Write a protein that binds this ligand. Structure first.
Ligand code: CLA
Ligand code: CLA
Ligand code: CLA
Ligand code: CLA
Ligand code: CLA
Ligand code: CLA
Ligand code: CLA
Ligand code: CLA
Ligand code: LHG
Ligand code: PQN
Ligand code: SF4
Ligand code: SF4
Ligand code: SF4
Lengths: 80, 143, 741, 165, 73, 41, 63, 73
């Protein structure tokens, strides 16, 4: 499983969730940096590590951060 | 909204057979099932390869990887404007619902889903790796 | 009526307003540059017309006028070669003595010591010995005067200006509609009747009336100054009826179908001209008459405006099998809707054709004194082989681009394309297995011979002596085409080539063409050829079939054709795109064709080319290919080290520039490895540490310095790799063969 | 006689090399006629060779055991024994031009910084401004040292550095 | 002599590359910026761009000019 | 022709013109002053 | 109100920012209790292609 | 010849140590990646984002320096 952490610089633009091809991220309301949305990563067991999320993050550098961790079948995109 | 139970009586799209389908991972570890209710018969694009014809009404489709199911999900949502929902099926018969885990799609708020893996600091306010040294496993300062 | 002219008047205004605004063709680059990557994207997307817009009509117009510009440039280049053969050549001296004088058409200015490059070629001339074979082509055309080259150059410049005027016209003044381009029936009918049918007919007319008499008199020892001019052979029928008495009969034998009377200038001789070492121009004239008839009847096949003919849609749609589903349906729409689907097929067949040309121009040398100019022959094989491989790689590229952009799954349901994409795993798996099988059983043979001869066990090698792998099928075909005039082609006086077997044709002491034997070494190298070809096919076809999706990345089509990677996820997804498969197929095309042209050079220098002074053919390398090329150390020693003696000792001589481009090409090739072995993220940080020094001195540019894209890094690396390797081989080949041949 | 080198005026391998090159060129010359283009070209090349060797031997160069001229990069050994125009004077002859190029580029950048779209004056050169600066930048050492003495040559630490500086 | 020289020189090159490699691993895994507050080792990281840019200049000049002289000859 | 002269002011055309001029200047220098190895004059 | 004016030039003091020690222009300052309220627009874009970013009141400074 | 090749040797040394020093100093952070210490010494990349981050680690700097070291020696 990779480590996806999301920081308080998230302005809540939903782009990281729309880019995620594995449904790892979701947008949670107001229980984060501020009100008006925030992101979260509850399903990191399905993260492959493609970093489309932080490719789409528009903040300075990346509010969403993928830290490549231990691999598995779900974290290596294996259909076998 | 409540968690939907997977209907096995749902038919499948008209596909002539490929080689990009299921492998021994389906029999051994897991596989995935995506469902959707269509309004017409439309030739869509399989993520495994080739084109299939969805049926008017409900459809069901097997996949060996979650990324395949979400690829078809975004294809059916963006090109056909449908609302699909997929699962995770285990070879012993256990079904685990996956995508709209709260009912609504994850880019939209739901007013009650809990924020996980949220570091409440700035990315430059992370500690140096000397402070997280000898924590057992090799650990990032983001923890 | 259906098939007709359909154009728009004055679609695009002719002004330099969009010349002053770079990046105008796209929505992203027209805003202006902020980083240097804009400067590269401006050039990478310049001719990517199908992303500037969506309407196929404007794309088609852009393509048409761009083709016109390419034709104008080709005409400029042709006129330049004719002009250099008119002003800066020893052509009129070479015609009198083509066996002694070296063809040269490039004079170097004496500025910084490069007057040493003006070699003593012959005919009281000093220049660079050309290897393009224009002198042989011109002699075969019947030129015999520099003035005719001069006026051909001026005609080429006129035609170039005409092509550029045509591009401007057919874009800005009167540009055709989409339904004009989509008349593929008419385009094929015309390109077969008039372009290739009437073109071959006209060239046959020239070959009847200008080439044949002029070259017949040139071969009879007549001086090119006292030969009748071609217009005198047109008007005065007495000269032609003296040279060919069937011209006394006029054109009546044609209209009376007493064609055998024409057997004086329309022959089926076969073999080579003993005095020039090339194909008989009467044979080529009859050839072009025949294929002109063939193409003119082939251009009356498709249905355009009168109900007779074929609809290509009807041929395609009615071709389907039980194994293949719906068959070729939707392919008419694919090819009348996608420019890239057309470009893929066209490039593939055009490059395979160029390699056909390379193989058929050395075994059947068409031009007088072409075979005995070993440099021209080697260069003409190598050049067209390389152009063919490049075109084939581009065919794979544009097939992938089709599959990414222009593919629509609604149009393609259980047709052949769908059925290929559905079992691409079987395709690529069997292709992988055969690539591995061939790699083992073709290269491990060379390794086995290296190990055996290094261990001192030459009786255990794979040779013509120890363990024979004889190419019996090719040997049988050689014997079948050598014995062809006796049984299976009774009206042929000889075989098509002397490479099948028989006697040699030697001209000027040098061997023009002689039988080519094949043994174990030839077996091994041919299987190496097939191996490398199959691996290149593996890469390019895997890029095509997996251009939309794979078991790794199912949404690769939305990612695009040209993207570096999806990420380090899934273990790492770099070079998953269909562009990077072309990037690797380029390397394997180079590795294939380098061996092809190496096989050519060594086999020719060992077993074909040479001199006959006494009783005996003395070849260049002495026939070592049979016994030396069983090993990699053989190709090292007796080819890459032995035949390199001419290029590294060329310093201080006329061929010194060849040694220079040897060393510089070795430089560029290795320079490519800075871009292929490395990655962007290092250079971006180096660049920003440099930008710090530029900021400190207030010289940081407004256009922010970025490292090259990942895709651009790979493209630069493959470009420098191919350039350096091919140019190293070019220098080595030419420096070797201009000296020893 | 700086590093054991013999002057090229009295070097024997130098003369042997001149004779060798002229012998090569006359070997090429003997196959041509009296007044033909190859003959005139080779005669001109022979004369260029003779003049080149004469001018190198006249300039006081030092030749090695191979007869080839060896340059003296050390100032002090070059200024003493008359070899300054080998590496030392062309050093400043280069540096003037190179700093001139760099200073014109710097001045152009600083000039276009103030405009509305500064990046478009870098892909599209403002040739009036560029030529004006290319002409008035011939005093680049004086203006450079005056920009240095005022402190306006170097940017302060408003430079974009990294997290660990 | 040849084997010994080439041997020890390649050994030296590999060892010297490993030296800087482990210096990097130090900067990552073992370096504490607060315990090295203001010392020479932090002063290196504070002017790292100057070091890298000047090393780049030396490399660039040497390559330009050595290759230029070699190609000229 | 303001736009045409803007085009000739672009980076590649100006570079072509300037390097053509520089190369021609160096070439004519090396013609009229052949083989300049040192600064003797 | 908090922060600088909505046209002021601002030097960024965030250490991990692309525009650290680099001048920017304020688009707006969100007057709520939001963390990182200052919206700064820059003439030069970062590696991602962005010219705007949200910064805090302690990460901004005049000129 | 000794002059020219000693300057080639200087080129190789300075460039090898340029790559190595750069990797060591930017081991902890760059403008393309200021959180590089949080990823360790040897990590593959930071994705195709931010223009491309291939061979951005310090490990990859050592890697690219081994080529220049082998050339130097
Ligand atoms: C980078 C290393 C390097 C160095 C130091 C040199 C140095 C030299 N080379 Mg070599 N060369 C190199 C690389 C190098 N080259 C490479 C890589 C190649 C392969 C392409 C060559 C190929 C080569 C050849 C083939 C030749 C040389 C020649 C020369 C000499 C040229 C002298 C000259 O042009 O006088 C120029 C003298 C000047 C004073 C001009 C200086 C520049 C400006 C104009 C001065 C400013 C004056 C004024 C203010 C301008 C007016 C302004 C204007 C706008 C009006 C010199 C020894 C030539 C020679 O004979 O060598 C001995 C020669 O024939 N080189
Ligand atoms: C593929 C096209 C092509 C190529 C590569 C060349 C290449 C060359 N030409 Mg040719 N030429 C061409 C087409 C071509 N030409 C055509 C179409 C014409 C008819 C107008 C000419 C007419 C021509 C003449 C009349 C001369 C050349 C010369 C030259 C040489 C130097 C040109 C030069 O320095 O220009 C400088 C260019 C710029 C400063 C810009 C070079 C080998 C020269 C030569 O070889 O002299 C011995 C020469 O005198 N060319
Ligand atoms: C396209 C190919 C081509 C062309 C152009 C020619 C051309 C010619 N051939 Mg050749 N020929 C060819 C292919 C060709 N041939 C082939 C393939 C063969 C093998 C079968 C031959 C075999 C052959 C033989 C055996 C002979 C010729 C001959 C001739 C000449 C007589 C033409 C003739 O009688 O036909 C009749 C053609 C016409 C009546 C058309 C004339 C059209 C004119 C130009 C119309 C223009 C007028 C204009 C409207 C108004 C005036 C403008 C202004 C003044 C006011 C002519 C030069 C003969 C000859 O002279 O030998 C040297 C001859 O004996 N040919
Ligand atoms: C009939 C031939 C033909 C045609 C019309 C096209 C047309 C096209 N190709 Mg295809 N292609 C071809 C042959 C062809 N190609 C071949 C032979 C190959 C194999 C090399 C490819 C490989 C290929 C790839 C891999 C890609 C294309 C792409 C494209 C599109 C844009 C090209 C562009 O903007 O480049 C503009 C021109 C350049 C950038 C110049 C390239 C610089 C070259 C490499 C320099 C070296 C050449 C020189 C002779 C060597 C001497 C150098 C000297 C100057 C020092 C366009 C539709 C692209 C596309 O559609 O993707 C969206 C793309 O990604 N092509
Ligand atoms: C010399 C360099 C080299 C070698 C040996 C290979 C070898 C191979 N490449 Mg690679 N490749 C290379 C350079 C090389 N490549 C470069 C520079 C590029 C450019 C980027 C590529 C790009 C590339 C691509 C894109 C592809 C390959 C493929 C292949 C395979 C096809 C041949 C095969 O399987 O035959 C069998 C193996 C050989 C011929 C290798 C030599 C082994 C010999 C016979 C001895 C065997 C030893 C024996 C087992 C004893 C063992 C001793 C014990 C002590 C261990 C093979 C693994 C293709 C592939 O994997 O698909 C099939 C493929 O698609 N390569
Ligand atoms: C790069 C370093 C360097 C080195 C190693 C030498 C080495 C030497 N110098 Mg030189 N020198 C140099 C730079 C150098 N010089 C510079 C930059 C200058 C100022 C332009 C001088 C000026 C200079 C003078 C004036 C003299 C030397 C002399 C000497 C010798 C004592 C010795 C050969 C002396 C000498 O002639 O040696 C015999 C001497 O008198 N040097
Ligand atoms: C006293 C010397 C010394 C010591 C104690 C260490 C110790 C260490 N190094 Mg350092 N290192 C050294 C020298 C040293 N190294 C040198 C000389 C270099 C430059 C070459 C490096 C470069 C280096 C890097 C770049 C990295 C380390 C890492 C490490 C750590 C783990 C090593 C590892 O992964 O093991 C397992 C290592 C291997 C299995 C080595 C791979 C196999 C090698 C390349 C040999 C292959 C040769 C082949 C078999 C020959 C066949 C011949 C046949 C064909 C005939 C460990 C702390 C790593 C670390 O700390 O991670 C953060 C790390 O990333 N080191
Ligand atoms: C022959 C191969 C080769 C060459 C020439 C270089 C050259 C260079 N590398 Mg190395 N490198 C290589 C292979 C090579 N590398 C390989 C295989 C790798 C492993 C991936 C690396 C890894 C590497 C790293 C990691 C680093 C370098 C760096 C450098 C630069 C060092 C500075 C220098 O010497 O400037 C002199 C430059 C040259 C000699 C090359 C330019 C050639 C001529 C002079 C340019 C002009 C030619 C001509 C006029 C233009 C024609 C073009 C057009 C008109 C057709 C330089 C560009 C360092 C760097 O960028 O720091 C500055 C650096 O950090 N390289
Ligand atoms: C090569 C010989 C392949 C064997 C052969 O004879 O194939 C012939 C076989 C017959 O195809 P059909 O006659 O059904 O195809 C009709 C065509 O008009 C396409 O629709 O082709 C296939 O089934 C698909 C390709 C098989 C590829 C197999 C490669 C092994
Ligand atoms: C060397 C290298 C670089 C660095 C190359 C730099 C960014 C660009 C090289 C030179 C540019 C083109 C500057 C040349 C000068 C400009 C064209 C402007 C002209 C100014 C005067 C010289 C006229 C990469 O960015 C890279 C990226 C991905 C894989 C491999 C590599 C790679 O090997
Ligand atoms: S790395 Fe890819 S799968 Fe993981 S969270 Fe980011 S976008 Fe989603
Ligand atoms: S893309 Fe970045 S800023 Fe937008 S919601 Fe995701 S993490 Fe927050
Ligand atoms: S190309 Fe670079 S960034 Fe992309 S996956 Fe490969 S290593 Fe990572």
């Amino acid at each position: 499983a990779h480590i996806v952490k999301i920081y308080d610089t998230c302005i809540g633009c939903t782009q990281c969730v729309r880019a995620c091809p594995l449904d790892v991220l979701e947008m949670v309301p107001w229980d984060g940096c501020k009100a008006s949305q925030m992101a979260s990563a509850p399903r990191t067991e399905d993260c492959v590590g493609c970093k489309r999320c932080e490719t789409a993050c528009p903040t300075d550098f990346l509010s969403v951060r993928v830290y490549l961790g231990s691999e598995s079948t779900r974290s290596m995109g294996l259909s076998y | 909204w409540t968690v939907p139970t997977l209907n096995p009586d749902t038919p499948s799209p008209i596909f002539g057979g490929s080689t990009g389908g299921l492998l021994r991972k389906a029999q051994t570890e897991e596989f995935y099932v995506i469902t959707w209710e269509a309004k017409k018969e439309q030739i869509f694009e399989m993520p495994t390869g080739g084109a299939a014809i969805m049926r008017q009404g409900p459809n069901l489709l097997k996949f060996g990887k979650k990324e395949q199911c979400l690829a078809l999900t975004t294809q059916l949502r963006n090109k056909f404007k449908l609302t699909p929902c997929f699962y995770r099926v285990f070879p012993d018969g256990k079904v685990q619902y996956l995508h709209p885990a709260d009912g609504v799609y994850p880019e939209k708020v739901n007013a009650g889903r809990v924020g996980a893996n949220q570091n409440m600091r700035r990315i430059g306010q992370n500690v140096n790796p000397i402070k997280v040294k000898f924590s057992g496993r090799m650990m990032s300062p983001a923890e | 009526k259906k098939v007709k002219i359909a154009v728009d008047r004055n679609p695009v205004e002719t002004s330099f307003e969009k010349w002053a605004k770079p990046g105008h063709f796209s929505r992203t680059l027209s805003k202006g540059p902020n980083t240097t990557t804009w400067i590269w994207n401006l050039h990478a997307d310049a001719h990517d017309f199908d992303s500037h817009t969506s309407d196929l009509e404007e794309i088609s117009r852009k393509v048409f006028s761009a083709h016109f510009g390419q034709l104008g440039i080709i005409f400029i280049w042709l006129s330049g070669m004719y002009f250099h053969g008119a002003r800066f050549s020893n052509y009129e001296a070479w015609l009198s003595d083509p066996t002694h004088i070296k063809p040269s058409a490039q004079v170097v200015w004496p500025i910084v010591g490069q007057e040493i490059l003006n070699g003593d070629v012959g005919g009281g001339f000093q220049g660079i010995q050309i290897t393009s074979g224009f002198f042989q082509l011109w002699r075969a055309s019947g030129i015999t005067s520099e003035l005719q080259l001069y006026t051909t150059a001026i005609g080429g410049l006129v035609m170039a200006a005409a092509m550029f005027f045509a591009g401007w016209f057919h874009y800005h003044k009167a540009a055709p509609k989409l339904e004009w381009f989509q008349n593929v029936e008419s385009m094929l009918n015309h390109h077969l009747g008039g372009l290739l049918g009437l073109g071959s007919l006209a060239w046959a007319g020239h070959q009847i009336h200008v080439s044949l008499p002029v070259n017949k008199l040139l071969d009879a020892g007549v001086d090119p100054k006292e030969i009748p001019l071609p217009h005198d052979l047109l008007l005065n029928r007495a000269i032609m009826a003296d040279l060919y008495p069937s011209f006394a009969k006029g054109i009546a034998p044609f209209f009376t179908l007493n064609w055998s009377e024409y057997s004086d200038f329309l022959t089926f001789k076969g073999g080579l001209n003993p005095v020039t070492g090339g194909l008989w121009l009467s044979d080529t004239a009859h050839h072009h008459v025949a294929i002109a008839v063939l193409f003119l009847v082939a251009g009356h096949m498709y249905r355009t405006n009168w109900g007779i003919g074929h609809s290509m849609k009807e041929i395609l749609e009615a071709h389907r099998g039980p194994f293949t589903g719906e068959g070729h349906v939707g392919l008419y729409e694919i090819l009348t809707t996608s420019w890239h689907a057309q470009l893929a097929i066209n490039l593939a067949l055009f490059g395979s054709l160029s390699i056909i040309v390379a193989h058929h121009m050395y075994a059947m040398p068409p031009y007088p004194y072409l075979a005995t100019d070993y440099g021209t022959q080697l260069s003409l094989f190598t050049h067209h082989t390389w152009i063919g491989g490049f075109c084939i790689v581009g065919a794979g590229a544009h097939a992938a681009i089709f599959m990414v952009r222009d593919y629509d799954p609604t149009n393609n349901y259980n047709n052949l394309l769908d059925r290929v994409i559905r079992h691409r795993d079987a395709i690529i798996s069997h292709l992988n297995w055969v690539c591995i099988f061939l790699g083992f059983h073709s290269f491990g043979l060379y390794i086995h011979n290296d190990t055996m001869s290094a261990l001192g066990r030459p009786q255990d090698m794979f040779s013509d002596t120890a363990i024979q792998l004889q190419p019996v099928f090719a040997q049988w075909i050689q014997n079948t085409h050598f014995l062809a005039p006796q049984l299976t082609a009774p009206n042929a006086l000889a075989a098509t080539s002397l490479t099948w077997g028989g006697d040699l044709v030697a001209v000027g002491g040098k061997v023009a063409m002689m039988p080519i034997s094949l043994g174990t070494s030839d077996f091994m190298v041919h299987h190496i050829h097939a191996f490398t070809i199959h691996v290149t096919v593996l890469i390019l076809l895997k890029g095509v079939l997996f251009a939309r999706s794979s078991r790794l990345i199912p949404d690769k089509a939305n990612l695009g054709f040209r993207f570096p990677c999806d990420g380090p996820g899934r273990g790492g997804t770099c070079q998953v795109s269909a562009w990077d498969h072309v990037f690797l197929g380029l390397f394997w095309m180079y590795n294939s064709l380098s061996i092809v042209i190496f096989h050519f050079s060594w086999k020719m220098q060992s077993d074909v080319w040479g001199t006959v002074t006494a009783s005996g053919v003395s070849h260049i390398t002495g026939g070592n290919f049979a016994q030396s090329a069983n090993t990699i150390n053989g190709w090292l020693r007796d080819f890459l080290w032995a035949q390199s003696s001419q290029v590294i000792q060329s310093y201080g001589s006329a061929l010194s520039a060849y040694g220079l481009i040897f060393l510089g090409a070795h430089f560029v090739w290795a320079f490519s490895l800075m871009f292929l072995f490395s990655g962007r993220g290092y250079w971006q940080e180096l660049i920003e540490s440099i930008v710090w020094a530029h900021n400190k001195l207030k010289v940081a540019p407004a256009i922010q310095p970025r490292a090259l894209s990942i895709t651009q890094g790979r493209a630069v690396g493959v470009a420098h790799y191919l350039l350096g390797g091919i140019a190293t081989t070019w220098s080595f080949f030419l420096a070797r063969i201009i000296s020893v041949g | 006689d700086i590093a054991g080198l013999t002057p090229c005026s009295e070097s024997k391998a130098y003369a042997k090399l001149e004779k060798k090159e002229l012998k090569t060129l006359e070997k090429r010359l003997k196959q041509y006629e009296a007044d033909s283009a190859p003959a005139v070209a080779l005669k001109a090349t022979m004369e260029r060779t003779k003049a080149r060797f004469a001018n190198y031997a006249k300039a006081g160069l030092l030749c090695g055991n191979d007869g080839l001229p060896h340059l003296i990069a050390d100032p002090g050994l070059a200024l003493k024994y008359g070899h300054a125009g080998e590496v030392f004077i062309p050093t400043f002859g280069f540096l003037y031009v190179a700093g001139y190029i760099g200073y014109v580029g710097r001045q152009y950048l600083i000039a276009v910084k103030g405009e509305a779209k500064p990046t478009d004056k870098e892909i599209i050169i403002d040739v009036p401004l560029a030529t004006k600066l290319a002409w008035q930048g011939a005093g680049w050492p004086l203006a450079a040292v005056q920009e240095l003495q005022r402190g306006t040559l170097l940017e302060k630490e408003e430079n974009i550095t990294v997290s660990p500086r | 002599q040849a084997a010994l020289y080439t041997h020890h020189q390649y050994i030296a090159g590999f060892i010297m590359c490993g030296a800087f490699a482990h210096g990097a691993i130090f900067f990552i895994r073992d370096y504490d910026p607060e315990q090295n507050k203001g010392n020479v080792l932090a002063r290196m990281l504070d002017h790292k761009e100057a070091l890298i840019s000047h090393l780049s200049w030396v490399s660039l000049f040497l390559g330009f000019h050595t290759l230029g002289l070699y190609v000229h000859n | 022709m303001k736009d045409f002269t803007t085009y000739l002011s672009t980076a590649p055309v100006i570079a072509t013109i300037w390097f053509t001029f520089t190369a021609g200047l160096l070439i004519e220098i090396n013609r009229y002053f052949p083989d300049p190895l040192v600064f003797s004059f | 109100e908090v922060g600088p004016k909505r046209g002021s030039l601002v030097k960024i003091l965030r250490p991990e920012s692309y525009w650290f020690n680099q001048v920017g222009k304020v688009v707006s300052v969100d007057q709520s209790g939001v963390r990182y309220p200052v919206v700064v627009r820059f003439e030069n874009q970062n590696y991602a292609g962005v010219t705007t970013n949200n910064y805090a009141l302690d990460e901004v400074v005049a000129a | 010849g000794d002059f020219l090749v000693h300057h080639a040797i200087a080129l190789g040394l300075h460039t090898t140590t340029l790559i190595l020093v750069k990797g060591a100093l930017d081991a902890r952070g760059s403008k393309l990646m200021p959180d590089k210490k949080d990823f360790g010494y040897s990590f593959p990349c930071d994705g195709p984002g931010r223009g491309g981050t291939c061979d951005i680690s310090a490990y990859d700097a050592f890697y690219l320096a081994v080529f220049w070291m082998l050339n130097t020696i």
